[PDB]
Amino acid sequence: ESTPIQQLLEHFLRQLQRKDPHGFFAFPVTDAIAPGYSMIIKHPMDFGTMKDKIVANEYKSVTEFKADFKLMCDNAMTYNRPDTVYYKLAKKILHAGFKMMSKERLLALKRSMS
C-alpha cells in the first residue's frame, strides 16, 4: 500500500485536522456556503483534497505539502473578516503547522534516519 513519505504526511494531516473537530476545513468551500468565494479566491484548498493528494502520491516533499496547508489557511484569512470563527481557526491551524513542520523539527527527524 503506502510509502514512508506518505506515512509522514498522513501523520502531519491527522494532527492538523484535530484542531478542527467540526470539520469547517474538511471539504471544499462552495459559493453556496460563501457568497462570491470563487471570484475572490483563485486557488481553493481543504483537508479532504490534501488527503486525496497524499494517497495519490502527488507530494514529492514536506515543502509541497506545507505549501498547500498554508494556501488553505491564507484563503480563509483573505476571504473571511477577522471577527469570524473561520478566520480565528485558520490562524490557530497556521501556527500549529509552522511549529509542527519547522526546520528544527525536520532536522531532528532527518538525524534519526541514519
Q: Residues in the site for ligand OFK, rule: CB under 6 A?
A: 24-25, 29, 33-34, 76, 79-80, 86
What SS3 class is residue 92? helix
**Cβ neighbours of residue 37 closer than 8 Å, sequence gap 6 or more:** 29, 30, 31, 44, 79
**In the complex, least distance from residue 25 CB atom to ligand OFK, rounded to whole angstroms:** 5
Residue placing its CB nearer to ligand OFK in the complex, 2 or 38: 38
For residue 60, the minimal CB distance to ligand OFK (Å) is 26
Specify the residue, 17 or 80, whose C-beta has the smaller distance to ligand OFK.
80
Contact 38, 79 (CB under 8 A): no
Give whichever of 51 and 62 is closer to ligand OFK, judged by the CB atom: 51
Cα–chain center distance at 99: 13
